[PDB]
Amino acid sequence: EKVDNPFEGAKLYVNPVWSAKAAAEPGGSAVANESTAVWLDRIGAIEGNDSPTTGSMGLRDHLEEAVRQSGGDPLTIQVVIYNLPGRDCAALASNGELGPDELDRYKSEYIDPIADIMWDFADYENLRIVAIIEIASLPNLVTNVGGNGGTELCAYMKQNGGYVNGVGYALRKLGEIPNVYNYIDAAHHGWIGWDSNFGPSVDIFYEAANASGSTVDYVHGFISNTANYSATVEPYLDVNGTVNGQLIRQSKWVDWNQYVDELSFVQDLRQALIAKGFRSDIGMLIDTSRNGWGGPNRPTGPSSSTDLNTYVDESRIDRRIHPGNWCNQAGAGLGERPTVNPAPGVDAYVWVKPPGESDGASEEIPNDEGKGFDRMCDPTYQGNARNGNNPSGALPNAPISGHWFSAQFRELLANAYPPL
Ligand SMILES: OC[C@H]1O[C@@H](O[C@H]2[C@H](O)[C@@H](O)[C@H](O[C@H]3[C@H](O)[C@@H](O)[C@H](O[C@H]4[C@H](O)[C@@H](O)[C@H](O[C@H]5[C@H](O)[C@@H](O)[C@H](O[C@H]6[C@H](O)[C@@H](O)[C@H](O)O[C@@H]6CO)O[C@@H]5CO)O[C@@H]4CO)O[C@@H]3CO)O[C@@H]2CO)[C@H](O)[C@@H](O)[C@@H]1O
Numbered sequence: 001e002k003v004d005n006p007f008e009g010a011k012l013y014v015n016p017v018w019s020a021k022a023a024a025e026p027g028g029s030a031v032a033n034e035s036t037a038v039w040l041d042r043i044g045a046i047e048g049n050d051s052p053t054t055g056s057m058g059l060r061d062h063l064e065e066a067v068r069q070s071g072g073d074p075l076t077i078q079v080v081i082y083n084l085p086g087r088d089c090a091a092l093a094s095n096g097e098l099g100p101d102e103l104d105r106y107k108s109e110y111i112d113p114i115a116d117i118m119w120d121f122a123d124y125e126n127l128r129i130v131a132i133i134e135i136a137s138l139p140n141l142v143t144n145v146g147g148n149g150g151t152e153l154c155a156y157m158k159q160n161g162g163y164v165n166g167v168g169y170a171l172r173k174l175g176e177i178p179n180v181y182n183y184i185d186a187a188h189h190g191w192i193g194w195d196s197n198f199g200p201s202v203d204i205f206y207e208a209a210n211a212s213g214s215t216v217d218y219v220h221g222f223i224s225n226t227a228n229y230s231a232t233v234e235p236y237l238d239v240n241g242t243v244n245g246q247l248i249r250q251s252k253w254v255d256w257n258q259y260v261d262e263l264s265f266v267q268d269l270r271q272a273l274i275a276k277g278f279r280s281d282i283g284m285l286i287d288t289s290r291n292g293w294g295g296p297n298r299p300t301g302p303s304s305s306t307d308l309n310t311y312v313d314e315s316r317i318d319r320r321i322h323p324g325n326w327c328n329q330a331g332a333g334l335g336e337r338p339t340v341n342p343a344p345g346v347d348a349y350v351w352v353k354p355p356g357e358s359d360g361a362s363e364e365i366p367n368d369e370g371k372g373f374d375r376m377c378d379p380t381y382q383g384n385a386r387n388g389n390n391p392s393g394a395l396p397n398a399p400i401s402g403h404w405f406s407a408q409f410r411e412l413l414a415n416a417y418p419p420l
Pocket residue numbers: 039040041053088090091093094135136143144188190191192194196197225226227228255256323324325326327353354357358359360386387388401402403
C-alpha cells in the first residue's frame with residue numbers, strides 16, 4: 001500500500017533551519033530552497049535542543065512544517081536516524097552520546113519517542129517520511145572488525161549485536177507506520193566496492209533486516225554515498241576498460257575495486273540484495289550533496305595519455321588523493337540537485353548530508369556531543385594503511401561535525417556540477 005517510490009509525484013521538504021544558514025552565505029540563496037534531510041543526531045534533537053547541529057526545531061516541529069509546506073498534496077521529508085550505541089565505531093568525529101552498551105536506551109529513549117511522534121502524523125495521507133537508517137554503521141562490521149587496521153569498538157559492536165539489533169529495531173518500529181519509508185545505509189563504492197567487502201555487506205544488511213522482529217518487508221531500499229564524495233558516474237573512466245593493454249583496475253586510484261562510481265555500484269548492489277532475499281521492488285538512493293566535482297579543475301574529456309595512472313588521474317572527476325579520504329574534502333562541489341528516478345533502479349538522487357555542515361573538527365574542540373578529534377579531518381595528517389598512507393585531503397579550520405562550515409559551503413557552491 002505504500003507507494004513504490006516515495007519521491008515520485010511529491011514536493012520535497014525544505015528545512016528552514018538549513019535554508020537560513022545557506023541563504024546567509026554569499027551566493028547561498030541559489031541553493032537555499034533545495035531539499036535536505038533532517039538529522040536526529042541526539043535524543044535531544046527529538047524534542048528540540050537548540051544545538052549547533054539541529055537548531056530550534058524538534059521532530060514534531062519539522063513534521064508540522066512538512067504538513068504546512070505540502071498544501072495537502074504529496075510531500076516527502078527525509079529524516080536521518082543516527083544515534084546507535086557506539087555510533088561511528090571506526091572513527092572519532094561523529095561518536096555519540098550512547099555508548100556501546102546502551103542498546104536498551106537507544107530503543108526506549110531514542111527510537112520509541114521518534115516512532116510515537118511519527119505515529120501522530122499517520123493521519124496525513126499525503127505526508128511521506130523517508131527514514132534513512134544509521135549511516136556508517138553496518139559496513140564497519142565488515143571492514144573494521146578483526147584482521148588488521150580495524151577497531152576494538154567495531155569488534156565489540158559486532159560481538160554484542162548492538163548495530164544489527166539496533167538497526168532491526170529501527171526498521172520494525174518505524175516501518176510499521178503507514179507513511180514511513182525505510183532506507184538502509186549502504187556505504188559507498190570506495191568503501192565496500194571490493195570483492196572482499198561487497199558480499200559480506202549484503203549478508204550483514206540481510207541480518208539486520210531480520211533482527212529485533214524485523215523482516216525485509218520493512219525495507220524500502222538502500223542509500224549510498226551518504227556524507228561522502230564518490231562520483232555518481234565517471235564519464236571518462238571505464239572500470240572494465242584498459243589503457244595500453246593494461247587494466248584500469250590496476251591503477252593506484254581504482255586499486256582492484258569492482259567499481260569506479262556510485263551508479264554502477266548501487267545497480268549491482270540492488271541486484272545482489274534482491275538475490276539475497278530483499279524485495280524485488282527495492283530502489284536505491286545516492287546522496288549527491290557533495291559529489292559534483294565541478295569548477296575549473298573538472299576534466300572536460302578523457303586523457304590522451306597511454307600511461308595507466310596518468311590516464312586515470314587526468315580522467316577521473318573524483319579528485320581525491322585516495323577514495324578512503326572521507327572528511328571535509330578539499331575541492332568538492334555540490335552534485336546533482338534532488339531528482340526523481342534519474343537512472344535504472346535508483347529512486348532518487350538526494351541531499352542527505354546537508355551542504356555546509358562539517359564532517360568533523362580539524363583540531364581538538366571541547367563539546368558535549370560525545371565527539372572526538374579524528375585526524376582524518378586534520379589537513380596535516382599523513383594518513384594510515386587504509387587511506388594508502390596519504391595526506392587526509394581535509395579542509396583546514398573545520399568545526400565539529402554537523403556544525404556550520406562557511407568555507408566548505410562556499411567551495412561546494414563554487415564547484416557545483418551541473419552548474420547552477
Ligand atoms: O550534518 C549532518 C550530521 O553529520 C554527522 O556527521 C557525519 C559525517 O559527515 C560523516 O563524515 C561520517 O561518516 C563517515 C565515517 O565517519 C567514516 O569512518 C567512514 O570511513 C570509511 C570510508 O568512507 C571508506 O572509504 C573506507 O573504505 C575503506 C574500506 O574500509 C577498506 O576495507 C578498503 O580496503 C581495501 C584497500 O583500500 C585496498 O588497498 C585493498 O586492495 O583492498 C581492500 C579491501 O579488501 O579500503 C577502503 C578505502 O580506504 O572505510 C572507512 C571506514 O573505515 O566514512 C563515512 C562517510 O562515508 O559521520 C557522520 C555520518 O556520515 C554529525 O555527526 C551530525 O551531528 C550531523 O547532524
